[PDB]
Amino acid sequence: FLTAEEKGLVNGLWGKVNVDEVGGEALGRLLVVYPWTQRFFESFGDLSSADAIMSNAKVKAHGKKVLNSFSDGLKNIDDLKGAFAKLSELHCDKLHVDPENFRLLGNVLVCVLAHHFGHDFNPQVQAAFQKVVAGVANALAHKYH
Amino acid sequence: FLTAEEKGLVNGLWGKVNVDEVGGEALGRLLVVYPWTQRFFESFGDLSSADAIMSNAKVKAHGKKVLNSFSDGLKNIDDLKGAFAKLSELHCDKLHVDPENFRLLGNVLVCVLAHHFGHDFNPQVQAAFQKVVAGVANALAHKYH
Amino acid sequence: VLSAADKSNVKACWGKIGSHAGEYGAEALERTFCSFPTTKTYFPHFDLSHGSAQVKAHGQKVADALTQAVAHMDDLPTAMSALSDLHAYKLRVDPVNFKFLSHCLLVTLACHHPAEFTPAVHASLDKFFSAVSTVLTSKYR
Amino acid sequence: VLSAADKSNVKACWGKIGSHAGEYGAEALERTFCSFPTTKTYFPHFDLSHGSAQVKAHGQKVADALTQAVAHMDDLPTAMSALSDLHAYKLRVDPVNFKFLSHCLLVTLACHHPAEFTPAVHASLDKFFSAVSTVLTSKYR
Numbered sequence: 361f362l363t364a365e366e367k368g369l370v371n372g373l374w375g376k377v378n379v380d381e382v383g384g385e386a387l388g389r390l391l392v393v394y395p396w397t398q399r400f401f402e403s404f405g406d407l408s409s410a411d412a413i414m415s416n417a418k419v420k421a422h423g424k425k426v427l428n429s430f431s432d433g434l435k436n437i438d439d440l441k442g443a444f445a446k447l448s449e450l451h452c453d454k455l456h457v458d459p460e461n462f463r464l465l466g467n468v469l470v471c472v473l474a475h476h477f478g479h480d481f482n483p484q485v486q487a488a489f490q491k492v493v494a495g496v497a498n499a500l501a502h503k504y505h
Numbered sequence: 506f507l508t509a510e511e512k513g514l515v516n517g518l519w520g521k522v523n524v525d526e527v528g529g530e531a532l533g534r535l536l537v538v539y540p541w542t543q544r545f546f547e548s549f550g551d552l553s554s555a556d557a558i559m560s561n562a563k564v565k566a567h568g569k570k571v572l573n574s575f576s577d578g579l580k581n582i583d584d585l586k587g588a589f590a591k592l593s594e595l596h597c598d599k600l601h602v603d604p605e606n607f608r609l610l611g612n613v614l615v616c617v618l619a620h621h622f623g624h625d626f627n628p629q630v631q632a633a634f635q636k637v638v639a640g641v642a643n644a645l646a647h648k649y650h
Numbered sequence: 651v652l653s654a655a656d657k658s659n660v661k662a663c664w665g666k667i668g669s670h671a672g673e674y675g676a677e678a679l680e681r682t683f684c685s686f687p688t689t690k691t692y693f694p695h696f697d698l699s700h701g702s703a704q705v706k707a708h709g710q711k712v713a714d715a716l717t718q719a720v721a722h723m724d725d726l727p728t729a730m731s732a733l734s735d736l737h738a739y740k741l742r743v744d745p746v747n748f749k750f751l752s753h754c755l756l757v758t759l760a761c762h763h764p765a766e767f768t769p770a771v772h773a774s775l776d777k778f779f780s781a782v783s784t785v786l787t788s789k790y791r
Numbered sequence: 792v793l794s795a796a797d798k799s800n801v802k803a804c805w806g807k808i809g810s811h812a813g814e815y816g817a818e819a820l821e822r823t824f825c826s827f828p829t830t831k832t833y834f835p836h837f838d839l840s841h842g843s844a845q846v847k848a849h850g851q852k853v854a855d856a857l858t859q860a861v862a863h864m865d866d867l868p869t870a871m872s873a874l875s876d877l878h879a880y881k882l883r884v885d886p887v888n889f890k891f892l893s894h895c896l897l898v899t900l901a902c903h904h905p906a907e908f909t910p911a912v913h914a915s916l917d918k919f920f921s922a923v924s925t926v927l928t929s930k931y932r
């Protein structure tokens with residue numbers, strides 16, 4: 361699914377990711393950038409402003425579980441489908457999230473990677489993480505029915 | 506790729522398709538409904554009216570060849586990637602076709618089936634052919650680079 | 651946008667439809683829900699069972715909105731103002747799903763009126779269904 | 792609809808970009824061709840290697856029209872008119888590719904102006920690029 365050339369660029373960059381805060385910045389921005397997605401997270405409390413969303417503790421901590429889910433999906437890249445089976449069922453049956461929304465969280469996460477890694481986040485590193493998020497997203501979409 | 510039931514609905518109807526014309530009808534509707542796709546087919550000739558397009562010998566002949574590849578992928582539903590690998594490279598390296606357009610041919614074709622089989626083209630039957638046409642589209646898109 | 655012949659084909663087609671517009675809107679929904687299961691995420695509190703009377707009732711309202719648009723192909727932006735809001739400001743349906751329904755509608759119309767569904771009328775309907783959806787997804791980005 | 796903060800965020804981010812515009816246009820394109828290979832089918836007559844003069848040149852033009860677009864945020868449908876026809880009708884670029892380019896425009900700005908690329912500036916830019924590419928896809932069919 362991923363060449364050793366790309367696999368190196370991905371894990372090379374992932375190994376540097378602040379695992380405590382890259383996910384909460386990605387989820388927070390999903391809610392700032394795409395305000396309608398907020399209706400799925402009302403249980404999270406105060407989301408009335410970008411500053412409130414970006415400093416929200418449930419947002420930050422749900423973001424870490426999402427990042428852990430990408431992390432664990434990287435460790436199973438040759439069968440993403442299997443690694444996202446129960447999360448696909450969850451997002452479908454329980455959460456009623458349109459998978460067309462999955463694309464938006466991958467793109468925001470990439471943007472978060474770009475924001476933090478700067479000149480290190482070159483076109484080639486990006487293309488590979490685009491490969492990853494697209495495949496994570498399609499795996500999360502696979503078990504809709 | 507399909508269930509046993511899906512395979513029977515898909516193959517059941519396909520045994521009833523006229524192979525000499527369903528493909529020509531589908532491609533000419535492609536050109537009528539989406540006239541900008543006629544850019545890709547200037548060597549075909551008088552593409553000037555719906556009637557010119559619908560009676561055009563080269564459209565019928567190409568259309569036939571397209572449908573035949575749909576049957577090929579039907580024989581080989583287990584590996585659509587393999588079966589559409591060379592076609593995928595052709596539309597990439599040679600015809601420079603945006604894979605986004607592939608679903609327009611799939612869709613127009615589903616309409617031709619709808620038109621011919623009327624009440625027999627039921628919602629469950631249609632839903633299996635959608636899995637097929639998007640599998641075919643994915644497979645034709647797989648080798649772009 | 652839509653040519654004078656486009657408007658002519660939609661009207662004449664819609665006139666063949668007649669009393670069946672609500673059946674067809676129901677069937678198109680049934681076809682969207684079935685062929686494109688992710689569209690069911692927009693109806694989590696609906697009975698989406700095969701033949702649901704709820705889906706039928708929603709079917710009638712889609713049809714009625716579409717009949718309205720036929721009678722207003724001249725300025726769908728204004729005719730469809732109210733409905734444009736509902737699909738952005740409570741629902742925010744991704745534009746793709748409008749593609750699924752539009753398609754499942756053409757498939758519905760071809761299944762019942764093959765003789766009217768000429769390539770040229772097929773073409774006019776596609777522009778129409780796509781014209782409607784464009785205004786129902788305006789209010790987005 | 793862009794708010795007043797959208798406009799001042801867009802203009803302030805653009806002032807920081809400064810003379811690096813065409814350079815970012817060129818990088819944005821290359822990232823697009825690279826991350827989303829199917830967009831390359833629209834430039835078959837192009838040399839698409841890194842450093843490509845031809846991509847640099849087009850990069851500038853795309854930069855220039857977005858700069859032109861920063862100054863006309865209240866009537867983008869007037870400022871992008873020639874360009875609307877070009878992408879929508881002459882070239883027939885599918886709307887999805889615009890999302891691909893817009894996204895890579897975001898990455899390039901996140902990469903180069905990280906302090907400026909706050910969650911709010913991110914959203915105002917997304918809202919901006921989407922409005923620009925809605926104009927450039929309007930004239931189809």
Ligand code: HEM
Nearest residue numbers: 397400401422425426429455457461462463465466497500
């Ligand atoms: C990029 C694709 C996505 C991935 C990998 C992902 C990941 C996850 C994971 C791992 C969980 C389980 C966390 C837990 O509760 O233990 C989760 C739950 C959840 N997801 Fe996602 N997600 C994605 C997209 C989305 C999107 C786009 C939305 C909304 C528009 C969404 C809405 C939710 C909600 C509401 C929950 C439950 C939160 C809670 O109740 O605490 N997901 N997701």
Ligand code: HEM
Nearest residue numbers: 542545546570571574600602606607608610611641642645
């Ligand atoms: C998933 C849908 C599609 C399938 C299954 C398909 C299949 C084929 C096949 C089998 C051929 C070779 C015909 C032969 O060997 O003589 C072909 C060629 C070709 N295709 Fe497609 N195709 C699809 C979509 C498209 C689209 C959307 C376009 C453009 C709008 C396109 C444009 C062409 C052109 C210009 C040729 C060369 C025809 C010629 O020989 O002049 N195709 N395709």
Ligand code: HEM
Nearest residue numbers: 689692693711712715716736741743747748751782783786
């Ligand atoms: C051809 C384009 C469409 C038309 C003309 C249309 C028409 C309508 C109409 C007439 C209503 C009645 C509500 C009212 O009067 O306020 C409605 C509501 C609604 N529509 Fe659509 N619709 C279209 C496409 C879609 C699509 C593609 C989806 C998502 C898959 C969708 C989701 C909904 C939902 C969730 C409601 C509210 C239902 C409820 O909560 O009871 N619509 N629409």
Ligand code: HEM
Nearest residue numbers: 830833834849852853856857878882884888889892923924
């Ligand atoms: C941010 C939105 C975009 C803007 C502002 C933009 C702007 C431009 C500009 C300034 C030109 C040059 C016209 C001239 O030289 O006279 C052009 C042409 C062109 N555009 Fe775009 N563009 C955008 C998005 C896209 C996308 C997404 C694609 C497809 C992947 C695309 C494909 C093309 C092509 C093939 C040409 C003709 C290029 C040539 O032959 O030199 N554009 N556009």
